[PDB]
Design a protein around this nucleic acid. Sequence first.
RNA 1: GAGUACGGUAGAGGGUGGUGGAAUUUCCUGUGUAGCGGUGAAAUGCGUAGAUAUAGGAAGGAACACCAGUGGCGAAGGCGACCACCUGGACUGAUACUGACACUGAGGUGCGAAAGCGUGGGGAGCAAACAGGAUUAGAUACCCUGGUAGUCCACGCCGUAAACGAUGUCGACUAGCCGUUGGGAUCCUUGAGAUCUUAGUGGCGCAGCUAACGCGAUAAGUCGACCGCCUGGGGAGUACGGC
Lengths: 59, 118, 55, 89, 103
Amino acid sequence: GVKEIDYKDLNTLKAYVSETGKIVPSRITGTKAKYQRQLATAIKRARYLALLPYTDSHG
Amino acid sequence: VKKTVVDGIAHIHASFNNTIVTITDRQGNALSWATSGGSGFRGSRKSTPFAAQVAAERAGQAALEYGLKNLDVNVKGPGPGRESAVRALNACGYKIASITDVTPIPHNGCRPPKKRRV
Amino acid sequence: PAVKVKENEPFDVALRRFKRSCEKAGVLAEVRSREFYEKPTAERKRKAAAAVKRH
Amino acid sequence: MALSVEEKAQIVNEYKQAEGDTGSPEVQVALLSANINKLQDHFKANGKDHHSRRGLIRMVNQRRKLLDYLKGKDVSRYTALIGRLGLRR
Amino acid sequence: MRHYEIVFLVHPDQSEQVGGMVERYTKAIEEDGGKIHRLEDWGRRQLAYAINNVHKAHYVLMNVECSAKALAELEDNFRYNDAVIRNLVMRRDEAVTEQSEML
RNA sequence: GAGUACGGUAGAGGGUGGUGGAAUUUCCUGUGUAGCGGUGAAAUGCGUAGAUAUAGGAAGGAACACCAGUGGCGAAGGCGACCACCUGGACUGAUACUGACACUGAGGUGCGAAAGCGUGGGGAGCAAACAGGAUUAGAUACCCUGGUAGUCCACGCCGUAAACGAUGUCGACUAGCCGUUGGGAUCCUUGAGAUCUUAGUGGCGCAGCUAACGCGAUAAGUCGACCGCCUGGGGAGUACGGC
């Protein structure tokens, strides 16, 4: 599973997005520190382009 | 008069000191409202879940005159009565389609007041 | 912080799922923390104690 | 490290003492001088960049230390270096 | 001479001239040594939230290789054009050509 | 030892401009009617001139929820939204190069939280002063309602903090055990863990030291180079003079 984390790749992004739209901590998912830092920057960067909601109560 | 509204929305502005329940339509046009402080509960009793359901039940029957049977619950804010007011909406004739917490969460925005040195 | 009531279940169990969604999101804890302004010294002192207890 | 690899490769061969030489003081001083002069443009536009100025001062102190060592070793080589580079202002 | 990845949202009412805009940009970017290494069109996607009032927009993906002048000129086009909204310019250390969103 | 040349890695390192979402406030409009707000309880306050609540719209400023972590970067002070541009350093691997070019450092010079000061902007929230309401024997407070400077920005000044690890910098040596960040090497090529090594970051702990508390490879142990500082408490980091 040699996958590169990126903001377009939404399918694995939702795996690390909580039900309310937050980012799940690394403790819950057991993600490496390096991956989570790059994971977080992808979620925020994709959040900008309206690919993901900033929060569930948008509107 | 009778607006004859079938679908509504119920808002519970539960706070640490008072609980304000407001029944509104899908477009945010209010019909009835009641508060814990307006139900004879003043002071220590205004911040009690029992006062919250009395407010919800008082506004609940005032809202059936519009012929309202369906509503969505929009509870907002912390306090003793966020859930006790919703349980009052079940006692009177109603079915709740959804229950949603709409409590505002700043994303580290405006500075809150200082700690109380009580 | 948002649940949908389904067909043919009591409204009581609809409530219990609702607060279970609430503490999962932790909205009550968030509003409690934003009630008053915690100074950076008090916030860093709290987090240092949190790390000590965790270890 | 504001100098590109081309600029670094450019100035190393004009100041190398022999083939493959990148550690001789002439290369070091020339390497620092080109970086020192290049950064002057940045600090003109960015006058509040105190943190990057700490690195620039280090490059200035490093060049001074190298020139003082070259002073002791061979004064003739030192004289040609500053004349070619236009130091000792 | 730096690889830039650009993703911008076009207004849904201006969805049929996104081809007219992109063909203008690609011509206007390669006139000074630019090249397009990647170019998709994700189409009319439903927005997670309303940008200003629209809940859907025309996403365009474009990866280029330009200079400072060309990138500033292109970014100027995005700013003074109400057709495009919510643009983002990325810097890349290497050029890519895969899809990674179409599939 | 110190340094240079090359590839790469991580980062809230710094500076200059844009951009986003949540929320607060203010204003406009619709619904709607007796309270809202606050407290231990009240009252000042807001509200029948229609408040709070609710919905739609607009302006503006400030900080960047989740990620977030005895996590990271920085000489320290400090640095948390995203992106673009300019830029410093560190870590990492081998080869190549100079060949002691080093350490410390009185003077000196530079940076230095917050508050504060000057000029000009800006001002949503918070809030010294101030005003009113409570409490109290009194309350120049704690609590509540408001609220100015200030907090924000640019350019200058100040130069102080429990500026703390209350532990100067640099180099070498001295059992181990359990975590964690950025790398590297070998087994595992494993799909996926294990063993060494390095730069940090933590918790125990032998020896050793300590008045004790405790430190214990991030030493307060064994040494070496240099520097700064102390000589009972108060008077007093005050007076006087100098800058």
